[PDB]
Amino acid sequence: SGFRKMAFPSGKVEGCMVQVTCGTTTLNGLWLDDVVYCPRHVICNPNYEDLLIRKSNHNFLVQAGNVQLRVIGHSMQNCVLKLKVDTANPKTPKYKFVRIQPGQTFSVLACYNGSPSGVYQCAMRPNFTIKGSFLNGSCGSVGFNIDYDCVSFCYMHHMELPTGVHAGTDLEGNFYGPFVDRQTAQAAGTDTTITVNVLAWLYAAVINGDRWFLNRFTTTLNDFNLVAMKYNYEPLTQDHVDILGPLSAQTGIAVLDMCASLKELLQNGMNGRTILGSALLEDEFTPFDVVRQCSGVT
Amino acid sequence: SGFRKMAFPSGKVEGCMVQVTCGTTTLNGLWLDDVVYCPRHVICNPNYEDLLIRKSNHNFLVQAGNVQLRVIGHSMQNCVLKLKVDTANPKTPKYKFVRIQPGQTFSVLACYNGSPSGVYQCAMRPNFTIKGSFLNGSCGSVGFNIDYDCVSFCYMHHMELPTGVHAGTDLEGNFYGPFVDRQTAQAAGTDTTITVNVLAWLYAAVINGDRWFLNRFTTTLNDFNLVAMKYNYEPLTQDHVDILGPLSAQTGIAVLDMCASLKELLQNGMNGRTILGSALLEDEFTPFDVVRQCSGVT
Numbered sequence: 001s002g003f004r005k006m007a008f009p010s011g012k013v014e015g016c017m018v019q020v021t022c023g024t025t026t027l028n029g030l031w032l033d034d035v036v037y038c039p040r041h042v043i044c045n046p047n048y049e050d051l052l053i054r055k056s057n058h059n060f061l062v063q064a065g066n067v068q069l070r071v072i073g074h075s076m077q078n079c080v081l082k083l084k085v086d087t088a089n090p091k092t093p094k095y096k097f098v099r100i101q102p103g104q105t106f107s108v109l110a111c112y113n114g115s116p117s118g119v120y121q122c123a124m125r126p127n128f129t130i131k132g133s134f135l136n137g138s139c140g141s142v143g144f145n146i147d148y149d150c151v152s153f154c155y156m157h158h159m160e161l162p163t164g165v166h167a168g169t170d171l172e173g174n175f176y177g178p179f180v181d182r183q184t185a186q187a188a189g190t191d192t193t194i195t196v197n198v199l200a201w202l203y204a205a206v207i208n209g210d211r212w213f214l215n216r217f218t219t220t221l222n223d224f225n226l227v228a229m230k231y232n233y234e235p236l237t238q239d240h241v242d243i244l245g246p247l248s249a250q251t252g253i254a255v256l257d258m259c260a261s262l263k264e265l266l267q268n269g270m271n272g273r274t275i276l277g278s279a280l281l282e283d284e285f286t287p288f289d290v291v292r293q294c295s296g297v298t
Numbered sequence: 299s300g301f302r303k304m305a306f307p308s309g310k311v312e313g314c315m316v317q318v319t320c321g322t323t324t325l326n327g328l329w330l331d332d333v334v335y336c337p338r339h340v341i342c343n344p345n346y347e348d349l350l351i352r353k354s355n356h357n358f359l360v361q362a363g364n365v366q367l368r369v370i371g372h373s374m375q376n377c378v379l380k381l382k383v384d385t386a387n388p389k390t391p392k393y394k395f396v397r398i399q400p401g402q403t404f405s406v407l408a409c410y411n412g413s414p415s416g417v418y419q420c421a422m423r424p425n426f427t428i429k430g431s432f433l434n435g436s437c438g439s440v441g442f443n444i445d446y447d448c449v450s451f452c453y454m455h456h457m458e459l460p461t462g463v464h465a466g467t468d469l470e471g472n473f474y475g476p477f478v479d480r481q482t483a484q485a486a487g488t489d490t491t492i493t494v495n496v497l498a499w500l501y502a503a504v505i506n507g508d509r510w511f512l513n514r515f516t517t518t519l520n521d522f523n524l525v526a527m528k529y530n531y532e533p534l535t536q537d538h539v540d541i542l543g544p545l546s547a548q549t550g551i552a553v554l555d556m557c558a559s560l561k562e563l564l565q566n567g568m569n570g571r572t573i574l575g576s577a578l579l580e581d582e583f584t585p586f587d588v589v590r591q592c593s594g595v596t
């Protein structure tokens with residue numbers, strides 16, 4: 001029993017974190033085989049191609065623990081700098097680089113000076129920011145998921161926006177969202193609530209033994225989405241209904257039946273009650289996160 | 299900016315998790331140097347001394363990854379079984395065993411069949427349970443804190459109570475709370491809210507840039523505790539006031555000034571507002587957790 005925000009065990013990523021210094025700029029890098037990946041703004045409205053052509057391999061100081069790694073080559077891929085080093089990381093896990101969709105979750109290993117400090121779960125918001133916890137020196141920290149000892153890296157942290165939320169790239173250096181890597185005040189689009197995740201979390205609550213929010217009503221998909229629009233929820237698609245199939249089958253509660261519960265919760269509030277220890281509707285658990293953590297029997 | 303429930307990086311503990319099997323009972327163990335620690339109920343109203351004297355070293359099957367470890371000795375310390383193995387764990391971190399006080403927090407590495415599955419933060423509740431997330435097979439999972447690469451183990455998981463909360467021991471096998479390791483329905487005492495942690499979390503909110511809940515009033519310690527009793531909060535001691543000193547100094551808000559805010563929040567609710575993304579008052583962040591994660595400048 002129970003339900004917590006749960007991160008993946010971080011050890012496979014801890015062994016890859018290094019420190020990258022250029023001039024007086026120091027941030028984190030990711031050491032996989034004989035390449036270190038880090039935000040290209042370590043070399044700093046900039047012209048990065050002009051700035052990088054003025055660089056030499058010996059301008060980059062890469063430190064793994066108390067060992068200095070020698071840079072033997074460098075290149076830029078979109079917004080990530082790639083530093084070839086003379087030593088392959090002996091702790092490289094099996095890994096992939098993946099670009100995720102909004103609404104998906106991942107674990108963040110927050111790092112400072114190449115040293116891991118903590119791990120927590122994030123969701124990619126519909127507006128392509130994350131609501132992280134990051135201080136100065138955290139840039140280059142990565143987000144990841146793990147499946148059968150393969151690490152799928154999906155996020156590298158690049159900047160905190162003026163609103164205090166966070167923006168970054170995939171590990172091939174492409175930003176999520178419309179952002180660019182320059183120190184200008186940039187604004188994200190208006191955010192929305194991840195409806196399919198809220199529904200997954202309601203199923204988690206039922207699996208854990210809580211039913212107070214259920215009702216005898218059902219709704220059509222179209223009528224539910226009219227309420228969704230009113231409360232700044234993302235539209236629920238038939239694909240979302242399909243992905244909730246397994247949780248619906250396990251609990252015996254049809255998806256559109258759970259939508260009628262969510263509709264009632266949106267229109268009336270919780271009236272002083274909690275769900276899985278929360279007084280608001282939680283949207284940073286995917287259906288996959290629920291299946292991963294909750295019992296396979298209700 | 300930001301504030302998340304943040305676990306310690308788990309890699310140093312991941313390298314210590316093993317599987318212990320006796321008969322048809324399998325749970326997790328902790329492999330440090332040449333000793334494996336696990337809940338003694340793996341050998342199962344039992345008489346453990348009588349049950350253990352009937353055991354042989356070869357009755358214990360210890361598996362680290364896909365490698366079997368040979369047990370060369372066994373003993374019982376309170377409610378933990380200690381299995382001497384023929385191989386010292388080459389990944390043993392620097393470590394200590396510590397017994398924590400209620401109100402303190404720790405990271406839990408949830409494990410199944412000796413394989414880590416996820417990491418999350420817990421607090422030891424005033425009634426000596428934890429509100430964990432655990433399924434069948436999780437017993438033997440451990441809780442820990444990390445300071446400068448030393449792992450302080452403080453919890454080993456032994457059982458889920460009928461209410462769905464969790465009970466366990468320190469790593470020397472002494473239960474937290476009044477519980478015993480037998481499969482009987484046991485009840486915890488009534489729980490209370492960890493007042494000093496709620497205050498720490500309000501300071502976290504101020505550091506992060508949120509002030510809406512402050513007021514111009516102060517309170518005496520005695521008058522605050524009269525309100526605390528009314529709302530099932532733990533009494534605030536002068537020691538608690540002292541430990542909040544650093545956060546009070548950083549924010550410029552006297553502790554008894556923040557108590558007046560908490561009093562107003564308890565008596566009036568939040569009136570539709572949130573604090574650090576929560577619609578209820580959070581009590582599983584210690585003052586230390588706040589200093590660790592939040593900026594050192596407001």
Ligand SMILES: N#Cc1ccccc1C[C@@H](N)C(=O)N[C@H](Cc1ccc(Cl)cc1Cl)C(=O)N[C@H](CC(=O)NCCCCN1CCCC1)Cc1ccc(F)cc1
Binds near residue numbers: 183
């Ligand atoms: N992570 C992180 C991090 C955090 C702090 C310092 C440094 C870092 C890492 C650090 N690497 C980092 O991100 N630095 C960026 C500056 C930067 C550097 C390289 C690039 Cl390529 C792009 C950017 Cl942009 C940074 O300094 N952002 C600040 C951070 C800030 O003040 N938050 C206050 C919000 C308060 C929110 N308020 C609270 C209540 C209401 C709102 C907001 C900002 C201001 C002006 C701008 F022009 C652009 C951005």
Ligand SMILES: N#Cc1ccccc1C[C@@H](N)C(=O)N[C@H](Cc1ccc(Cl)cc1Cl)C(=O)N[C@H](CC(=O)NCCCCN1CCCC1)Cc1ccc(F)cc1
Binds near residue numbers: 482
């Ligand atoms: N972790 C864990 C875990 C979880 C499940 C299975 C197995 C394990 C690990 C597993 N190792 C474990 O703990 N097993 C214990 C049984 C046990 C074994 C060795 C010892 Cl020495 C002591 C105990 Cl006691 C266990 O089966 N507890 C159940 C678990 C249970 O049904 N929760 C339902 C609560 C629903 C809560 N409701 C929801 C809404 C309202 C309340 C509650 C219980 C029932 C009767 C008793 F006599 C004592 C305890």
